[PDB]
Write a protein that binds this ligand. Structure first.
Ligand SMILES: O=S(=O)(O)OC[C@H]1O[C@H](O[C@H]2O[C@H](CO)[C@@H](O)[C@H](O)[C@H]2O)[C@H](O)[C@@H](O)[C@@H]1O
Ligand SMILES: [Mg+2]
Length: 246
Protein backbone atom coordinates (compact mmCIF):
# COMPACT_ATOMS: atom_id res chain seq x y z
CA UNK A 1 0.00 0.00 0.00
CA UNK A 2 3.03 2.33 0.16
CA UNK A 3 3.08 4.97 -2.60
CA UNK A 4 6.26 6.07 -4.42
CA UNK A 5 7.71 9.05 -2.58
CA UNK A 6 7.43 12.30 -4.57
CA UNK A 7 7.66 14.88 -1.74
CA UNK A 8 11.00 16.71 -1.81
CA UNK A 9 10.92 19.13 1.14
CA UNK A 10 12.19 22.63 0.66
CA UNK A 11 15.56 22.98 2.36
CA UNK A 12 14.10 25.22 5.09
CA UNK A 13 10.65 23.81 5.93
CA UNK A 14 9.32 22.73 9.36
CA UNK A 15 10.52 19.11 9.21
CA UNK A 16 12.43 16.98 11.71
CA UNK A 17 14.51 14.32 9.95
CA UNK A 18 15.27 10.79 11.15
CA UNK A 19 17.51 8.49 9.13
CA UNK A 20 18.29 4.82 9.47
CA UNK A 21 21.81 3.83 8.52
CA UNK A 22 22.43 0.34 7.16
CA UNK A 23 20.32 -0.27 4.09
CA UNK A 24 19.19 3.39 4.10
CA UNK A 25 22.17 5.80 3.93
CA UNK A 26 24.82 3.15 3.13
CA UNK A 27 24.64 0.03 0.99
CA UNK A 28 24.44 -3.44 2.50
CA UNK A 29 27.85 -5.11 2.79
CA UNK A 30 28.84 -8.66 3.76
CA UNK A 31 30.41 -7.36 7.01
CA UNK A 32 29.60 -4.18 8.98
CA UNK A 33 33.18 -2.84 8.85
CA UNK A 34 32.98 -2.61 5.05
CA UNK A 35 30.07 -0.15 5.21
CA UNK A 36 30.70 3.47 4.25
CA UNK A 37 28.42 6.51 4.05
CA UNK A 38 29.98 8.59 1.23
CA UNK A 39 31.43 11.94 2.23
CA UNK A 40 29.06 13.87 -0.06
CA UNK A 41 26.06 12.21 1.59
CA UNK A 42 27.30 13.28 5.03
CA UNK A 43 27.78 16.88 3.89
CA UNK A 44 24.22 16.81 2.54
CA UNK A 45 22.95 15.41 5.85
CA UNK A 46 24.91 18.05 7.77
CA UNK A 47 23.62 20.81 5.48
CA UNK A 48 20.05 19.54 5.84
CA UNK A 49 20.39 19.56 9.64
CA UNK A 50 21.83 23.08 9.77
CA UNK A 51 18.91 24.53 7.79
CA UNK A 52 16.41 22.91 10.18
CA UNK A 53 17.80 24.09 13.55
CA UNK A 54 19.72 20.81 13.91
CA UNK A 55 16.60 18.60 13.95
CA UNK A 56 18.24 15.63 12.22
CA UNK A 57 19.10 12.33 13.89
CA UNK A 58 20.44 8.91 12.95
CA UNK A 59 18.23 6.14 14.37
CA UNK A 60 20.15 2.88 14.00
CA UNK A 61 20.60 -0.55 15.44
CA UNK A 62 24.36 -0.04 15.60
CA UNK A 63 26.13 1.18 18.71
CA UNK A 64 26.69 4.94 18.91
CA UNK A 65 30.48 4.50 18.72
CA UNK A 66 30.11 2.79 15.32
CA UNK A 67 27.74 5.54 14.14
CA UNK A 68 30.28 8.22 15.08
CA UNK A 69 32.89 6.31 13.07
CA UNK A 70 30.64 6.11 10.01
CA UNK A 71 29.59 9.78 10.25
CA UNK A 72 33.05 11.24 10.92
CA UNK A 73 33.84 14.14 10.98
CA UNK A 74 30.20 14.95 11.74
CA UNK A 75 28.46 14.41 15.07
CA UNK A 76 24.70 14.07 14.95
CA UNK A 77 22.07 13.34 17.56
CA UNK A 78 21.87 9.56 17.64
CA UNK A 79 19.84 6.60 18.75
CA UNK A 80 21.89 3.43 18.95
CA UNK A 81 20.95 -0.21 19.54
CA UNK A 82 17.34 0.30 18.40
CA UNK A 83 16.79 2.97 21.09
CA UNK A 84 18.71 1.51 24.05
CA UNK A 85 21.37 4.20 23.44
CA UNK A 86 20.52 7.80 22.60
CA UNK A 87 22.40 11.10 22.46
CA UNK A 88 20.36 14.31 22.35
CA UNK A 89 21.25 17.63 20.73
CA UNK A 90 23.28 18.69 23.79
CA UNK A 91 25.48 15.58 23.71
CA UNK A 92 23.78 14.11 26.79
CA UNK A 93 23.51 10.32 26.49
CA UNK A 94 20.66 8.11 27.71
CA UNK A 95 21.62 4.45 28.17
CA UNK A 96 19.54 1.44 29.18
CA UNK A 97 21.47 -0.60 31.76
CA UNK A 98 21.11 -4.37 32.11
CA UNK A 99 22.35 -6.31 35.14
CA UNK A 100 25.93 -7.47 34.65
CA UNK A 101 24.86 -11.01 35.55
CA UNK A 102 22.39 -11.13 32.65
CA UNK A 103 24.79 -9.92 29.95
CA UNK A 104 27.56 -12.22 31.17
CA UNK A 105 25.23 -15.24 31.26
CA UNK A 106 23.56 -14.69 27.87
CA UNK A 107 26.84 -14.13 26.03
CA UNK A 108 28.25 -17.37 27.45
CA UNK A 109 25.18 -19.28 26.24
CA UNK A 110 25.24 -17.73 22.76
CA UNK A 111 29.02 -18.16 22.42
CA UNK A 112 28.69 -21.88 23.12
CA UNK A 113 26.38 -22.22 20.13
CA UNK A 114 28.15 -19.78 17.80
CA UNK A 115 31.67 -21.24 17.97
CA UNK A 116 30.36 -24.58 16.53
CA UNK A 117 28.17 -23.18 13.65
CA UNK A 118 30.48 -21.87 10.92
CA UNK A 119 29.69 -18.55 9.29
CA UNK A 120 27.63 -17.03 12.08
CA UNK A 121 28.85 -13.99 14.02
CA UNK A 122 27.96 -13.00 17.58
CA UNK A 123 28.02 -9.21 17.97
CA UNK A 124 28.08 -7.83 21.52
CA UNK A 125 26.68 -4.32 22.07
CA UNK A 126 26.87 -3.90 25.84
CA UNK A 127 23.15 -4.21 26.50
CA UNK A 128 22.25 -6.23 23.38
CA UNK A 129 23.46 -9.00 21.05
CA UNK A 130 23.23 -9.54 17.28
CA UNK A 131 23.38 -13.01 15.71
CA UNK A 132 24.61 -12.48 12.14
CA UNK A 133 24.18 -15.27 9.59
CA UNK A 134 24.63 -13.53 6.22
CA UNK A 135 27.50 -15.88 5.28
CA UNK A 136 25.57 -19.02 6.34
CA UNK A 137 21.82 -18.54 5.78
CA UNK A 138 21.22 -22.25 6.47
CA UNK A 139 21.57 -21.39 10.20
CA UNK A 140 18.61 -18.99 10.29
CA UNK A 141 16.08 -21.29 11.96
CA UNK A 142 18.54 -22.46 14.62
CA UNK A 143 19.57 -18.89 15.49
CA UNK A 144 15.96 -17.67 15.62
CA UNK A 145 14.95 -20.50 17.96
CA UNK A 146 18.06 -19.87 20.08
CA UNK A 147 17.19 -16.21 20.61
CA UNK A 148 13.55 -17.12 21.32
CA UNK A 149 14.74 -19.39 24.14
CA UNK A 150 17.01 -16.61 25.45
CA UNK A 151 14.16 -14.10 25.53
CA UNK A 152 11.81 -16.53 27.32
CA UNK A 153 14.36 -17.33 30.04
CA UNK A 154 15.49 -13.72 30.53
CA UNK A 155 12.31 -11.59 30.45
CA UNK A 156 14.31 -8.35 30.39
CA UNK A 157 15.30 -9.19 26.80
CA UNK A 158 13.21 -8.99 23.64
CA UNK A 159 13.61 -10.28 20.10
CA UNK A 160 14.35 -8.04 17.09
CA UNK A 161 14.59 -9.82 13.75
CA UNK A 162 16.47 -8.14 10.91
CA UNK A 163 18.03 -8.70 7.49
CA UNK A 164 20.27 -11.79 7.84
CA UNK A 165 20.39 -11.09 11.59
CA UNK A 166 18.47 -12.09 14.71
CA UNK A 167 19.01 -9.53 17.47
CA UNK A 168 18.38 -9.60 21.22
CA UNK A 169 17.63 -6.26 22.92
CA UNK A 170 16.32 -4.91 26.24
CA UNK A 171 12.55 -5.21 26.52
CA UNK A 172 10.84 -1.90 25.85
CA UNK A 173 13.50 -0.76 23.36
CA UNK A 174 12.39 0.10 19.81
CA UNK A 175 12.94 2.85 17.25
CA UNK A 176 9.43 4.20 17.78
CA UNK A 177 10.21 5.04 21.39
CA UNK A 178 13.59 6.51 20.39
CA UNK A 179 11.89 8.85 17.91
CA UNK A 180 9.27 9.74 20.54
CA UNK A 181 12.00 10.80 22.98
CA UNK A 182 13.52 13.14 20.40
CA UNK A 183 10.15 14.60 19.37
CA UNK A 184 9.56 16.06 22.85
CA UNK A 185 12.99 17.75 22.91
CA UNK A 186 14.26 20.81 21.12
CA UNK A 187 15.01 21.32 18.27
CA UNK A 188 12.85 18.42 17.11
CA UNK A 189 9.77 19.52 19.06
CA UNK A 190 7.25 21.46 16.99
CA UNK A 191 8.33 19.97 13.65
CA UNK A 192 6.80 17.29 11.41
CA UNK A 193 8.71 13.99 11.79
CA UNK A 194 10.24 12.34 8.73
CA UNK A 195 11.64 8.82 9.11
CA UNK A 196 13.40 6.81 6.38
CA UNK A 197 14.17 3.14 7.10
CA UNK A 198 14.57 -0.26 5.46
CA UNK A 199 14.29 -3.14 7.99
CA UNK A 200 11.86 -4.61 10.50
CA UNK A 201 13.24 -2.50 13.36
CA UNK A 202 12.12 0.61 11.45
CA UNK A 203 8.48 -0.53 11.42
CA UNK A 204 8.03 0.61 15.03
CA UNK A 205 9.32 4.02 13.98
CA UNK A 206 7.02 4.06 10.95
CA UNK A 207 4.04 3.41 13.21
CA UNK A 208 4.61 6.31 15.63
CA UNK A 209 5.48 8.69 12.78
CA UNK A 210 2.30 7.81 10.89
CA UNK A 211 0.13 8.42 13.97
CA UNK A 212 2.01 11.67 14.68
CA UNK A 213 1.11 13.12 11.27
CA UNK A 214 4.59 12.73 9.80
CA UNK A 215 6.13 11.09 6.74
CA UNK A 216 7.37 7.48 6.83
CA UNK A 217 9.51 6.16 3.97
CA UNK A 218 10.34 2.50 3.36
CA UNK A 219 13.56 1.83 1.43
CA UNK A 220 13.66 -1.18 -0.84
CA UNK A 221 11.53 -4.27 -1.11
CA UNK A 222 9.01 -5.68 1.36
CA UNK A 223 5.65 -5.22 3.02
CA UNK A 224 5.57 -2.13 5.21
CA UNK A 225 3.28 0.14 7.18
CA UNK A 226 5.26 3.15 5.93
CA UNK A 227 3.16 5.45 3.75
CA UNK A 228 5.86 6.11 1.12
CA UNK A 229 8.56 4.09 -0.60
CA UNK A 230 12.02 4.61 -2.07
CA UNK A 231 13.57 1.94 -4.28
CA UNK A 232 17.16 1.76 -3.07
CA UNK A 233 19.95 3.49 -1.17
CA UNK A 234 21.00 5.53 -4.27
CA UNK A 235 17.40 6.79 -4.39
CA UNK A 236 17.82 7.98 -0.82
CA UNK A 237 21.04 9.67 -1.93
CA UNK A 238 19.28 11.26 -4.91
CA UNK A 239 16.32 12.38 -2.78
CA UNK A 240 18.72 13.84 -0.23
CA UNK A 241 20.50 15.86 -2.92
CA UNK A 242 17.12 16.99 -4.29
CA UNK A 243 16.14 18.48 -0.89
CA UNK A 244 19.35 20.52 -0.79
CA UNK A 245 19.65 21.61 -4.45
CA UNK A 246 16.31 21.59 -6.34
O1 LIG B 1 21.10 1.17 11.14
S1 LIG B 1 20.43 -0.17 10.99
O2 LIG B 1 19.91 -0.39 9.61
O3 LIG B 1 19.32 -0.12 11.99
O4 LIG B 1 21.47 -1.40 11.36
C1 LIG B 1 20.92 -2.51 12.06
C2 LIG B 1 22.00 -3.54 11.99
O5 LIG B 1 22.89 -3.13 10.88
C3 LIG B 1 24.16 -3.88 10.79
O6 LIG B 1 23.88 -5.13 10.17
C4 LIG B 1 23.33 -4.93 8.92
O7 LIG B 1 24.34 -4.30 8.03
C5 LIG B 1 25.46 -5.20 7.70
C6 LIG B 1 26.37 -4.53 6.69
O8 LIG B 1 25.59 -3.78 5.77
C7 LIG B 1 24.95 -6.53 7.15
O9 LIG B 1 26.06 -7.43 6.89
C8 LIG B 1 24.00 -7.16 8.10
O10 LIG B 1 23.56 -8.42 7.53
C9 LIG B 1 22.84 -6.26 8.36
O11 LIG B 1 21.88 -6.85 9.28
C10 LIG B 1 24.84 -4.07 12.14
O12 LIG B 1 25.90 -5.03 12.02
C11 LIG B 1 23.89 -4.49 13.20
O13 LIG B 1 24.58 -4.51 14.49
C12 LIG B 1 22.76 -3.55 13.29
O14 LIG B 1 21.88 -3.93 14.36
MG1 LIG C 1 18.60 -0.55 8.13
Amino acid sequence: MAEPLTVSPELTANYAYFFDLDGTLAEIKPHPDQVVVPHKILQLLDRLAAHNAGALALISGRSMTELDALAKPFRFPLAGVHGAERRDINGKTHIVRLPEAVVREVEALLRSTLVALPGTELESKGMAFALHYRQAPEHEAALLALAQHVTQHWPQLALQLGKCVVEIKPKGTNKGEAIAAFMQEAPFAGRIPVFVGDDLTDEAGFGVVNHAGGISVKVGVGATQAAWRLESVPDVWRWLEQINYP
